[PDB]
């Protein structure tokens, strides 16, 4: 309502419109290549900025600050795992996807294994995973942020947000979102650093955070409800391993073996196997540029500890009776959620700490985060649907029809997400960010398993790869179904779920499920008749440098020696900095 906020939001919209108009004037959106793969013309800084911006949504502010508030700094693990896995994208996965000549990741499996059915299976599974693990988090965390910071209607505001991002997505191709993602990455980091600064000033520096956080308990630990009573000292007190990434392998909330192995498997899928991230790398002008983009994205994937997780911990320190409330009556009075109020951590810092001018900037940050993630999901899902499902139903379709079907799919997935908004608003508190990481850990590891076996084990054939994916979903669904049955509850009200099904951390189930899907794929592969070498040139990590005539069931990825040498040294320096920071907070 102060004019400075409205001018900052209009200035942000003018930046995004301006870069969109410039990209549309520059690039060709008349062809499938241009609109879905940016012309394969995207140099390193759009690729890095877009990898970052496609990933960091409103979920990262609300979820990582919230979980920061609730559980301390191990949740940085989600982000910091990414750092290692992006080097598997640029150096292992991205080269093979450039030599395969693929527009989609289901198409890669079509070329590698050769059935009609692995491509269709994976497209449909990918579309569900984007409704459940990507669109859900953006709608939900957007709606949290609006409820707390703005106070507007959390239906109408989400319809408006989903509708503006619809236009932003359909209007330009992959070249408009990736240039716009360079501005959105600048706004996200810029405004998020300014909030980090205000937060750290309020606790009295970095020393302030680490001497006040373990003391930051609520004073209201007695419920008016009988059979709740005096709340346990275990839940309202901060965890005494709050300052440690590497938490106890059986009793830790994020066990360290589960963080390192189990997140690498789920991050495997998310960064190396999944249309949303990999489209950014299928649009790079060459492999050196993809690799350089993968370095930038890695350094940006450090920033979320300092910009989201530690600010959420400062919110617990500053507003302990509101962010760290345990009494259901008090939590229902504070944010409307009986199971806790972690999720208000990030949007209370914006309300309480930001002056007249910068509240607007932090609204622009959440909008930049929300729009970049939602647009990237809509565009990738548009590509999946168009180029895998619609080219099945119409093979002789052609590049004008496929762009129209592409643009109408964005309208349909927006309408599906409006339909889905009440089911995601049924998630009560910080439960949702556990559900998304649980669903990612039950559906993604069989896909991680087939992509690693597709890329490194040429014996693995179509029967193996398909029956591994279906075996994989059967095991994943055993966990997912019985769980969601028993609910979550809270630490105050624990669920009646049987220890067996869920004592085991969901990221540990990721490791089991990966090796079981991989084992089933290898076993059914080794039983059934193999795929020979004439079917496999430039589709496997071995044969990415082949030049031989493939028989089907940009091809040249050799880069300048000097620029190769530069990006290879920068991958090693970025891993040293990663490893130092994991040691520092271990």
């Amino acid at each position: 309502d102060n004019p400075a906020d409205i001018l900052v939001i209009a200035a942000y919209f003018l930046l995004v419109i301006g870069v969109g108009l410039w990209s549309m004037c520059r690039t060709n959106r008349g062809t499938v290549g241009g609109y879905f793969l940016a012309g394969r013309s995207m140099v390193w800084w759009p690729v890095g900025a877009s990898l970052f911006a496609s990933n960091i949504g409103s979920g990262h502010f609300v979820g990582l600050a919230g979980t920061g508030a609730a559980s301390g700094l191990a949740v940085a693990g989600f982000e910091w795992n990414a750092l290692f896995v992006v080097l598997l994208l640029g150096w292992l996965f991205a080269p093979v996807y450039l030599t395969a000549g693929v527009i989609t990741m289901p198409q890669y499996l079509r070329k590698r294994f050769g059935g009609r059915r692995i491509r269709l299976y994976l497209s449909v599974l990918s579309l569900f995973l984007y409704i459940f693990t990507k669109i859900s988090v953006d709608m939900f965390s957007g709606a949290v942020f609006i409820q707390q910071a703005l106070g507007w209607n959390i239906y109408a505001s989400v319809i408006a947000l989903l509708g503006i991002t619809m236009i932003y997505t359909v209007t330009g191709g992959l070249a408009a979102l990736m240039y716009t993602d360079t501005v959105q990455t600048f706004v996200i980091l810029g405004g998020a650093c300014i909030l980090m600064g205000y937060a750290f000033h309020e606790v009295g520096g970095y020393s302030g955070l680490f001497d006040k956080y373990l003391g930051a308990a609520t004073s209201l630990t007695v419920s008016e409800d009988p059979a709740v009573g005096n709340i346990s000292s275990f839940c309202y007190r901060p965890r005494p391993d709050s300052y440690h990434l590497l938490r106890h392998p059986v009793t830790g909330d994020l066990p360290w073996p589960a963080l390192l192995l189990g997140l690498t498997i789920v991050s495997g899928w998310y960064w190396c196997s999944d249309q949303v991230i990999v489209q950014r790398c299928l649009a790079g002008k060459s492999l050196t540029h993809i690799k350089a983009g993968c370095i930038l994205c890695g350094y940006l994937k450090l920033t979320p500890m300092f910009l989201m997780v530690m600010p959420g911990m400062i919110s617990r320190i500053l507003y302990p009776d509101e962010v760290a409330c345990v009494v259901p009556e008090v939590c229902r009075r504070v944010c409307g959620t009986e199971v806790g109020c972690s999720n208000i951590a990030y949007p209370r810092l914006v309300v309480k700490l930001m002056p007249n001018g910068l509240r607007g900037l932090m609204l622009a940050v959440m909008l930049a985060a929300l729009m970049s993630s939602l647009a990237s999901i809509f565009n990738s899902s548009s590509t999946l649907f168009t180029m895998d499902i619609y080219t099945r139903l119409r093979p002789r379709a052609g590049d004008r029809e496929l762009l129209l079907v592409g643009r109408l799919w964005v309208v349909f997935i927006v309408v599906v997400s409006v339909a889905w908004l009440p089911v995601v608003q049924a998630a009560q508190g910080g439960q949702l960010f556990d559900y998304i990481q649980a669903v990612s850990s039950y559906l993604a590891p069989p896909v991680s398993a087939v992509f690693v076996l597709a890329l490194f084990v040429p014996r693995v054939n179509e029967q193996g790869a398909f029956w591994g994916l279906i075996g994989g979903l059967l095991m994943g669904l055993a966990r997912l179904i019985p769980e969601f049955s028993f609910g979550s509850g809270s630490c105050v009200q624990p669920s009646a779920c049987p220890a067996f099904l869920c004592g085991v951390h969901y990221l540990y189930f990721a490791i089991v499920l990966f090796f079981c899907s991989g084992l089933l794929t290898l076993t059914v592969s080794l039983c059934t008749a193999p795929i020979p070498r004439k079917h496999l040139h430039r589709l496997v990590f071995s044969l990415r440098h082949s030049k031989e005539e493939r028989e089907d069931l940009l091809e040249d990825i050799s880069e300048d020696p000097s620029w190769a040498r530069v990006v290879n040294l920068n991958a090693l320096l970025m891993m040293a900095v990663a490893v130092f920071l994991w040691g520092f907070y271990a």
Binding site: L572, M575, A576, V579, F580, L581, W582, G583, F584, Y585, A586
Partner: peptide, 29 residues
């Protein structure tokens, strides 16, 4: 000390990458 854990972590990582250059140099060529 956090700083010693950081430096020790980096030192172990530089040992592993030195091993990776050793193994591919002697066992791929």
């Amino acid at each position: 000390q956090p700083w010693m854990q950081g430096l020790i972590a980096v030192a172990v990582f530089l040992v592993l990458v030195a091993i990776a250059f050793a193994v591919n140099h002697f066992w791929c060529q």
